[model samples]
Target: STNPPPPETSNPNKPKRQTNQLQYLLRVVLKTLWKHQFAWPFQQPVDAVKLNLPDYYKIIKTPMDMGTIKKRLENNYYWNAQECIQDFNTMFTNCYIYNKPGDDIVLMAEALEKLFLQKINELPTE
Candidate 1:
C-alpha cells in the first residue's frame, strides 16, 4: 500500500514565505549609505529594537537621482570605524555590477575609502 503524504506537504494554505533576497541585498547598500550620510547620532540602548533608522528606510523606498546620491555621499560626514569600511566594501562589491540608473553606491564606496581610510593609514603607528 502507498504511504500517505505529509500534512504540510499537502496543505496549500501553508505555502512558504518567500524572501526577496535581492531586495534585501539592495537595502543593505542603501542602509549603509544612509548610516554614513544622514543618520543622526542617538543613544542606542542595549536590547532596544534599533528600528528607527528613518533615513535608511526612506532612501531605500524612494527612487533616487544618481547625481544627488553622489552629492550626498561626497558631502556627508563619514564614520571612521573599521566595521563601516568592511560593510561598505561588501555592499559595494555586491551591488557595483548592477549599475542601477540612479544608484552610485559603488562610487560612494570608493570615494569613502579614498577619502577616509587612506588618511587613517597615514596616521603614525605607535
Candidate 2:
C-alpha cells in the first residue's frame, strides 16, 4: 500500500508558489554569510562611540552590516539580486577602506567576500 501525501485542492497540477525564485536564493546566500566565521566583525554596524572612532563617520560615508542587510531582505527591500550583491560589496569595501590593511579584519573581510561571491553564484539572477 503506497499512500502519497494528498494535494491541497485534490489536484496535483497546482502547488504553492514562491515570491521570486531569485529572491529566495538570495535570502539563503545572505543567511550563509551571517553565520560564517569570518563574518564576526561584520555582523552589526560599527558603534563609533563604543569603538572610540571619532572619525569613523568622517571616513566611511556608507556603512553596512549583516543585520541591516538581513532585515531589508526579510521585508523585501531589494528590488533584485543585483541590488543585494551591491550591498554585500559595499559591506566588504567599507572594511577595507576603514580598517588597517595589515590587520586581521582586512583579511577576514577578504575571506568573507570570496565566500560570499561563491555562495551567491549558486543563484540565477535575472
Candidate 3:
C-alpha cells in the first residue's frame, strides 16, 4: 500500500522576491477564498493588503471612532455610491498573476487603463 501525498501548495521553498512575491501573495488569497467559498476571486484584495480594519480595540475612546472600515465597505457595497466596487472589480477580476511570457500581461495593462478611465469619468468639469 502507498500513502496519499499532500495537497499542492504555492508555498515552495524558494525566495519569492519582486514579481514572484506578488504571485505568491495572490495564490494565498485565491487559496483562502477557495476555502471560504467566496464568489469574488479578489473579494478583499485591497482590504487584505492595505485598508484592513482592526476588529478589536484595547485602548480608549470617547464616542468611539467607528473606524473607516464601515465607510469604505459602504462605498463598495452600495449601488448608489461611487463605483468603488466596479473599480476594484475591474482591477482584481481581470488581474494577472504571473508575468511570464505569453501570460495575461494584457489583463494587467487593462487594469491600468481602467484607472485613467475612472479618473477621467470622476473628474469635475471646469
Candidate 4:
C-alpha cells in the first residue's frame, strides 16, 4: 500500500513542501542574512520564496564575496551595521568547519553572541 501526501497549493503547480527543524533553522538564518546583507552566500542555496523579508524585497538570489569580506574585516573598514552583518554571516557559513558536525548550529548562534558583544564594546560611553 502506497500513500502519497497532498500537493502544494499556493502557485497551483508546485509540489508539496516538507521541512524539519534543520530546514527551518536554515530558512531563518537565510532570511535574517538577506534582510541585512542584501546578498546571499555564494556557496549555498536558498528557497525561492521567503516570508520574513520586507514586502519590497524582490525575493531574488545573489552571491556573497568571501574575499572582500575578509578584506573589510582585516582593514576594519565597515561603516555600517550591514557590513557587520555580512561578517557575522561568514561565521555562520563557516561554522561547519569550526565545530563538530552536529554542533555547527550552536557555533552559528555563538557568532551572533560575539557580534553583539563586539557591538556593545564599540558603543561610546555616556
Best by lDDT: 2
Please provide, for model 4 over 1-126, each residue's C-alpha lDDT reduced to its tens digit, 9 standing for 90 to 100: 221221111243433332332232233433343334323332232212342323211322222233343333333344443544555464454443333566744554455545445544443322
Stretches off by above 4 angstroms in model 2 are: 1-22
Greater TM-score among 2 and 3 belongs to 2
Return the lDDT, model 1, position 38.
24
What C-alpha lDDT values do all the predictions have? 0.34, 0.69, 0.30, 0.37
Task: Estimate the TM-score of every prediction.
Answer: 0.25, 0.77, 0.21, 0.25
lDDT over C-alpha atoms for residue 54 of model 2: 80
Clashing residue pairs in candidate 1, if any? none
Instruction: Please identify which of the two predictions, 1 or 3, would achieve the higher lDDT against the true structure.
Output: 1
Better of 2 and 4 by TM-score: 2
Evaluated against the true structure, the overall lDDT of model 4 is 0.37
Provide the lDDT at 78 for model 4. 45
Candidate 3: give its CA RMSD in angstroms: 19.3
lDDT of 4 at 88: 48
**Candidate 3, lDDT over the whole model:** 0.30
* CA RMSD of all predictions: 18.6, 14.2, 19.3, 17.3
TM-score of 1: 0.25
